[PDB]
Nucleic acid binder design. Sequence first.
RNA 1: UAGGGGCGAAAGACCAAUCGAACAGUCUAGUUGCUGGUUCCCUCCGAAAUGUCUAUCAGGACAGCGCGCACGCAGAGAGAAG
RNA 2: AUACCACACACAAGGGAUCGUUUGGCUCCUGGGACGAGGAAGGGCGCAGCAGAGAGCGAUAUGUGUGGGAGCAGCAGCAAUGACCACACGUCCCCGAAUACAGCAUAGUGCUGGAGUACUCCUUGGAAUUAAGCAUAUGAGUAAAGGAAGGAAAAGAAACUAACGAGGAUUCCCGUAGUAGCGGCGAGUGAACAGGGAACAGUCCAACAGUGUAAUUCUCAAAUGAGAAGUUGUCAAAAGGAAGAAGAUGUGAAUCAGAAAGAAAAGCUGAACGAUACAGGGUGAUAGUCCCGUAGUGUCUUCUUACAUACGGUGAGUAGCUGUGCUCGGUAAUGCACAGUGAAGAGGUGGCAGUGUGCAUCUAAGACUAAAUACAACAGGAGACCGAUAGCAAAGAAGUAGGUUGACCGAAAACAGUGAAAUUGUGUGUGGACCCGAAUGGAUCGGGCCCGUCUUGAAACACGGACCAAGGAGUGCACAUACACUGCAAGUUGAGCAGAGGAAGUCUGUGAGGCGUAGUGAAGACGGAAAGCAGUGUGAGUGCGACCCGAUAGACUUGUGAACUAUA
Lengths: 89, 219, 131, 110, 97
Amino acid sequence: SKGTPSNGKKNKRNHTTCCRCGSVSFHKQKGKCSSCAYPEKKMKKMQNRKAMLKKTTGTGKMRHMKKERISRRAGYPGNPILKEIRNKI
Amino acid sequence: MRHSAKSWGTGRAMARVPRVRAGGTRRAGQGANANFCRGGRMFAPTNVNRRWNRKTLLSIRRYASAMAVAATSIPAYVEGRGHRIEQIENIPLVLSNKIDTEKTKEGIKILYNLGLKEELDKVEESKNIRAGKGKWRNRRYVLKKGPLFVYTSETSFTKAIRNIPGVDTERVENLSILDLAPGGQAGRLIIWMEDAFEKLTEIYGEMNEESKFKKGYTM
Amino acid sequence: MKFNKNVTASRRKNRKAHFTSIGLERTKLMNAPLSKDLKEEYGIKRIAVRPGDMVKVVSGEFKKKEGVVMKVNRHDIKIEVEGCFVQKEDGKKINKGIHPSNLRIIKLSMEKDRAEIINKKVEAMKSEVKA
Amino acid sequence: MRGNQMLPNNHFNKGSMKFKNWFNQPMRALKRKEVREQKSKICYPNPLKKLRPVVRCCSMRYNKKVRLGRGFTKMEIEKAGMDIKYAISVGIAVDLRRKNKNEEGLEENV
Amino acid sequence: MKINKLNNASKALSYPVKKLAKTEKAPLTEKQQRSKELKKFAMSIAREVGGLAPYELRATELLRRDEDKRCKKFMKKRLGSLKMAKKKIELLAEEMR
RNA sequence: UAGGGGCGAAAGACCAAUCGAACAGUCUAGUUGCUGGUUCCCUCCGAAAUGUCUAUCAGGACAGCGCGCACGCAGAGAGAAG
RNA sequence: AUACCACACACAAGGGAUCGUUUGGCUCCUGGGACGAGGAAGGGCGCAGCAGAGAGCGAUAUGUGUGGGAGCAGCAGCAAUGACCACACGUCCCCGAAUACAGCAUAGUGCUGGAGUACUCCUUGGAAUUAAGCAUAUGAGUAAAGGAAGGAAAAGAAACUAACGAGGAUUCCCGUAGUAGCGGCGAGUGAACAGGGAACAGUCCAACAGUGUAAUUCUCAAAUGAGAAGUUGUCAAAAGGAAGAAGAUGUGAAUCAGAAAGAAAAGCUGAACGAUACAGGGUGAUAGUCCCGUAGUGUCUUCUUACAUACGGUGAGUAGCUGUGCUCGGUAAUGCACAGUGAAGAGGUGGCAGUGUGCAUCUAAGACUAAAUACAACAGGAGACCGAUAGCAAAGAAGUAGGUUGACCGAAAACAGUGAAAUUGUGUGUGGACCCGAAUGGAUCGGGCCCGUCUUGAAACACGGACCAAGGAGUGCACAUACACUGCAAGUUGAGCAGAGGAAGUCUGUGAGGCGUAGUGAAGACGGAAAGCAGUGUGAGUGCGACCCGAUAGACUUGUGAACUAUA
Ligand SMILES: [Zn+2]
């Protein structure tokens, strides 16, 4: 029967951890990730605005982008040992 | 309106309000979007398209300001607002030009000589913290209204008197009804400058004539 | 009246600026007045209280007392003064902290960099006073 | 629908319709003032605005009224003894599209 | 309603201006003449090198039989405009002569 | 091998406790002539369940009967006598 | 009724309402609009003396330099041989466009790819809904899906309007106008020139380059040589500047004492003092003079911007035509395409089909362009906004705890305040369901069926309701309208926009348009009664979620599923 007794046979596992996004959604037989479309070059279309804002720029650390803004503020000064190269250029 | 919600329909022994689709949390099966629901949407949400300002005819604005100015020289009205004028010799007050004052120290001595001491004291003693939620929204302290000084020509006296509590300043040419009738009751006490007092004849004209300064207006 | 529009007059903003202060701005919170004599001995009118300096308590329970500053709590803005304490049920004694502004300085601790700190402030005045 | 009225015709059916409010009106006025002021310093002795011709308005309804136009014609400028390069240097506006068809209109602009 | 009160006769009146005559531009300078000559010359060489197109042959054939009204209808359908047809017929006629 | 599509020794069976057209999310607060509900006090006036037309018969509109503001004013839900 | 059941009051339990408070939210305005092969955005894993989560940082996981200067929150230890902070730099593990790759250009060096996409441009393209049914039409060229760029983007100097006594690039605001018209002429749709302003700026290529010599660009050498591109055509000139704006930071006046009372005075009482500073915040109760500021004044650093040569009148599978499909208010074709057909050098247009002829106005099939205009992330300032069941989902380690096979889905919890009601125990009183009227020392007497709701008709064998708290439903805008109130009146008006002003307020100009000052007809045409305009509000109609809640269904996606079950 289709209820409790059929639950006993459910011991196989079709999805594993995706290497691009972490989300335990890589379908091994299809060769595709259901969250991010790996191995396609572009990321997947997200279903709605609510769901996509959960993965935008600024939801993580933004390491490089923050440093760039501080350097731009300072006038891109560079390493002080090498000022002469900068000044010539 | 954020959540994914749907009605369960009849046959489940429950009211047919929309409910939240979820699992693993106590939030499953709770009642979603309606105005009678916790965390739902308000009835007729407030909206930016409301009409904030109001029109008034220019002819009424001109007439109201004229009869507000008039009331500043009837003792019954001035006393009625709550300005105290027991010690003042006569109304209206007109200060001369050739006031060479630059310091607040000497400025107060002048105002005391015109009899204003009791009025000024009445303002200083008044400061209190407002009752209600307004004290959280940048409206913390309340003070009583005092004298308004009206000038027309630029003078040092303006920056000598301004730090004294309850003193207020405006030019005659752009004198406003909010300053002339606070709270919608008329008869504010006014210190005129000699130049400003003479200018009232150009501004409002003469009875059954037309003002040159206010085109299309007659008294 | 304030005529500069870059400075805030919001109650919410002024309060956050107080409690979340750090660095030099935190040091400004620990300032106290000098006595009349010291204001002739030195140019300064007020300084940040440090251990070892001598203070008169001018407000509160311990009014009129005099003593040496033992400790400076920067996180919970309080100073501990020698001989200002309460006794528990146990008989054990706990120093009670006083807010900086309720103190007045009577003698300065001149250990370490204090003499240079004072010099730096006096010069900063004269630089603009004489102009 | 009941009673006597002028029959409705109110066009609010389209759900994609945008609304425009004007809360910025006093502030944008203040910015336009401050831009003119600083522009006036950059060319201090000279007026901020150029000289423009007088032309006659268009239809039967406005024939009897005169108005400012875009620029003087090469013929107007020449008749008054100037050259085009000089006129520009002295703050006169120029429009080479306009034509002259009357004696009166020419005489006034000279 | 402030519309449709005057008659058409009175709407046609006009104010008495003084007009300026138009400046005629008839003189054509030496260099402009040579320019035009060279363009017209170039048009000869193309016709000499490459000859007539199929519908031009069919058209000129009808002109020899004096089938004037047939040629007119034919050319109208090829070029679209009755003006272009009238012009092209006149150019073809002159070529044959 | 995937949704107006699959697969079926054929029962409209089965396609993640869902199938005479799956699930997720959005358009969308889809529509409702139909059912349920609609939050303080006193004072004064006070109905209708009928006619005409309607894809009209559990609905509308127009007229008839209420109330408010009222320019004004010799009238009357009763009798006599021809 | 000894002990059960009910009610009242006092005390103890049980719960978290109410009042007082808020380093959070929301809305409007101003600035900003800064990513990546020099490896981004996003994911994982490591790093502390005792260290889980979160924050910070990369095996250099608190290093160097500059400016300052006192502690490191617990315990043990450190610190003028520099605790801690601020500015810049150095170092920067593994996965990921992920590349020892793909496509492509140059004499050579190289460039693209992924992320973001609120606002702008280019394609593709619904249905619910309204018509009280429905098929053309509407919603709507909207949603959805794809491509691309910048701080704005697009557009832009007439193959343009107009018929006046004419004007003169583009964009934006007021207006013509809910008009001319389109439409099962139904429902409904719907522009342009004028007239008043903001801001203003014009120019390039081809046609068409010295022939007494390619005079032109590049490479190596050298101080004057070799070589590459190119005759299928290269080559058409100036430095230069002070202004303007935004930030950062220094300084910065003036008070003491007292009875009563309180844990504590800044309150209250007396006596003083400052002010170009009485904006606001902190201190053990309500502070101009106790602390941080404010008015007024100094310094410094960045950014933006500016003079030269030569020319005209023919830019083709184009304009147009026939057929066809979509589109627009565009109507015997407004714009865009596809197939046939296909010009002239002279052509295009003048809101109704054709043919002819004068007249007016322009010059298509190649390119560039400032200012005035639009709006997320991030930063700053304001508010007749909300005050922990509200305001963002989120005032704490919130897109978290936790959940789906998957796409995706998603909470609660403020103060160690106050401490209501439901409900429970103990004590003391009064009754046997309770309400209204009237009383006794005391038995009781008389009257009353359970509320809300549809209904001719409810106590009903009609439906909803166990009990208490808190939340919980006729609102906002546009357009005509009748009434009440106000100013002026043959007139009336806060259009936008300019001038003044320590300013989202107020005052003053310039100056359109609209409606009114009289009507009749389809129109040509004619002409002869009746106070209006603009506001502040109330009743009422129509369109938008439209008093609040509620279908079975329809469509769209470059979204997901054969772990159960079917077949090869
Ligand atoms: Zn993935």
